[PDB]
Every structure is written in structure tokens, then in C-alpha cells.
Amino acid sequence: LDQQTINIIKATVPVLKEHGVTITTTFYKNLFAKHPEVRPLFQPKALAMTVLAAAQNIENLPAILPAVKKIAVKHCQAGVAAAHYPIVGQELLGAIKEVLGDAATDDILDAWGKAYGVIADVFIQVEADLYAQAV
Amino acid sequence: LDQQTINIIKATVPVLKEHGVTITTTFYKNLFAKHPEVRPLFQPKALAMTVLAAAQNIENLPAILPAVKKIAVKHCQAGVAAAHYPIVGQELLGAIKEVLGDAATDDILDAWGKAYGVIADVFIQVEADLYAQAV
Ligand code: HEM
Numbered sequence: 347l348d349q350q351t352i353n354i355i356k357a358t359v360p361v362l363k364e365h366g367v368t369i370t371t372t373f374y375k376n377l378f379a380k381h382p383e384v385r386p387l388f389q390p391k392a393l394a395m396t397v398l399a400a401a402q403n404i405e406n407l408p409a410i411l412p413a414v415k416k417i418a419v420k421h422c423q424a425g426v427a428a429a430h431y432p433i434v435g436q437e438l439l440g441a442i443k444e445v446l447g448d449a450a451t452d453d454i455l456d457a458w459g460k461a462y463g464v465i466a467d468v469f470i471q472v473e474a475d476l477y478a479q480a481v
Numbered sequence: 482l483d484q485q486t487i488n489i490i491k492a493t494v495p496v497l498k499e500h501g502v503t504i505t506t507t508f509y510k511n512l513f514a515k516h517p518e519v520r521p522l523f524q525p526k527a528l529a530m531t532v533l534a535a536a537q538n539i540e541n542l543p544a545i546l547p548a549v550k551k552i553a554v555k556h557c558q559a560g561v562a563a564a565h566y567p568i569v570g571q572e573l574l575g576a577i578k579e580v581l582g583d584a585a586t587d588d589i590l591d592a593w594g595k596a597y598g599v600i601a602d603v604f605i606q607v608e609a610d611l612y613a614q615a616v
């Protein structure tokens with residue numbers, strides 16, 4: 347939620363987007379290898395790139411609501427839980443570090459974790475509301 | 482968007498809530514007196530108190546979505562414009578100043594204006610999207 351964090355996301359997103367294919371493939375490979383328990387829920391190739399896109403609009407998250415709402419329904423149909431969020435975040439950050447190489451400073455990583463946390467929260471809330479609206 | 486603002490918001494809402502009746506009545510009196518052009522759009526007594534309620538959940542705005550969405554539709558049926566937001570904001574702060582009196586320091590008022598801008602931004606975006614979906 348901090349401006350420096352915001353500045354670092356703004357500065358780095360473009361660099362990450364240039365390596366989209368690698369982030370996407372590394373993320374899936376690790377997610378499935380390390381967390382076999384999520385395999386039954388499933389590839390949406392856009393999952394990771396959508397996070398970056400949300401991050402690119404961090405100052406105007408409300409603008410991405412219409413997309414967030416459509417994905418949320420799919421997540422609620424599949425059984426996605428708030429406890430899944432951190433696991434996906436962990437694997438995304440790992441993919442990001444691999445791509446950044448040297449340039450992966452602890453401050454950049456920490457920024458991306460904070461950023462992911464915020465974006466994950468919107469999804470978690472919207473989804474908690476849909477599951478509740480279900481009864 | 483800063484911690485102090487938030488601190489200031491968290492510390493004073495309760496005090497504002499205690500004088501709700503005054504804030505609500507002062508806000509409506511000045512709004513209509515000073516901006517006759519909005520009169521044709523209309524009183525929702527809960528207008529001001531709902532902003533206070535959003536402010537108090539300022540760290541978790543997504544959680545108030547279901548309410549924001551029901552109001553937004555009513556705002557779009559009525560012709561509410563992004564340009565109306567600042568006017569309502571100005572009258573709200575005026576009401577808050579009256580109530581705070583001595584305690585109405587410049588930093589407190591600046592924090593509330595900040596808080597209001599953020600909340601207003603959510604409604605504006607949500608409404609812009611509804612207006613766009615209308616065609
Ligand atoms: C903020 C993080 C997340 C974002 C941005 C996101 C984004 C996406 C996107 C863009 C899609 C494809 C939507 C479509 O075109 O239909 C998708 C589908 C899916 N996501 Fe998420 N996802 C997120 C977190 C998660 C988590 C934590 C899990 C848990 C394992 C997860 C599991 C799934 C599954 C199972 C689907 C497939 C839905 C289906 O086709 O039935 N996602 N996600």
C-alpha cells in the first residue's frame with residue numbers, strides 16, 4: 347500500500363511482461379509439482395499475466411472489477427479457497443525471481459509480494475461474497 | 482492513502498458518528514442551498530453516514546462492494562455524474578468541520594478529504610462501468 351512499493355511495481359512490470367512466457371511456464375510447472383493437491387481443481391494460461399495486469403493498475407483496481415467478477419465466478423464454481431491464495435503467490439514470486447536474476451533485489455521481491463497480497467484480497471472478498479450469495 | 486491519514490480516519494469516525502444527526506442535516510442544508518442545480522436529482526438520509534461507514538472500512542473496501550453496487554445502480558438511474566462528487570465532498574467536509582470545532586485541525590480535514598477522494602473514486606469507476614454496459 348506504500349508509494350515506494352507502488353513505484354517499484356510501476357518500474358518493474360514492463361520488465362516482467364517482456365518475459366511473460368517464462369513466468370507463465372515456470373509458475374505452472376512449480377505450482378503443479380509442489381502442490382499436487384491443487385491439481386484436481388484444474389491450463390488457464392493467463393493466470394499469471396492477469397496478476398501483472400492487475401498490478402499495472404494498482405492505483406485503479408476498481409477499473410478491473412468487471413474482469414475480476416467474471417474470473418471470481420469461475421473460481422467459485424471450481425472450489426477455490428482463500429487458503430489457495432498464498433500458495434499461488436509463493437509460486438508467482440518464485441517465477442519472478444528466476445526471471446529477474448541478479449536484478450532481483452529483496453526490495454523488489456518484497457514489493458511484488460505486497461502487491462500480490464492486495465490483489466489477492468480483492469479476489470478473496472468478492473469470492474467470499476459470491477459463496478455467501480449462493481444460499 | 483497514507484498511514485497517518487488512516488490513523489486520523491480511525492480515531493475520528495467514532496466522534497463523527499456520535500454527531501451523525503448534525504452532520505447529515507448540515508450537509509443537506511448546504512448542499513441544496515449552494516448547489517440548486519443538483520436539486521432536480523432528488524432525501525437519502527443515509528448518504529453521509531454511508532461515507533463514514535466506508536471510511537471506517539477503508540483498509541478493506543472490497544468488503545463493502547455489495548452495498549456500493551446497489552447504490553451505484555441508483556446513482557446511474559438518477560444521472561449522477563463524476564463531476565458531482567467534488568461538490569458532495571466539499572459539503573461533507575464543511576459539515577465535519579462544524580462538528581469538530583476546535584479539534585478540526587488542518588491535518589484532520591486534509592485526511593478526511595483524502596479519505597473521501599478514495600471512496601468517491603470507487604463509486605465513479607463502478608458507475609462509469611455501468612453506464613458503459615448500458616449500451
Ligand atoms: C490473484 C490471483 C489470481 C488470478 C489473477 C487468477 C486469474 C485467473 C484467470 C485469468 C483465469 C481464467 C479465466 C477464464 O478465462 O475463464 C483463472 C482460472 C482459474 N483459476 Fe485463477 N487466478 C488467481 C488465483 C487463483 C488461485 C489462488 C487458484 C487456486 C488453485 C486459482 C485457480 C483457478 C482455476 C482452477 C481456474 C480454472 C477455472 C475454470 O475454467 O473452471 N486461481 N484464474
Ligand code: HEM
Binds near residue numbers: 529556
Ligand atoms: C461516495 C459518495 C456517495 C455515497 C456514499 C452515496 C450514498 C448514497 C446512499 C446510501 C443513497 C441511498 C440508497 C438507497 O437506500 O436506495 C444514495 C442515493 C442517492 N445519491 Fe448518493 N452517494 C454518494 C454520492 C452522491 C453524489 C456525488 C450525488 C450527486 C448529486 C448523489 C446523489 C444521490 C441521489 C440523487 C440519490 C437518490 C437515488 C434515488 O432514490 O433515485 N450521491 N446515495
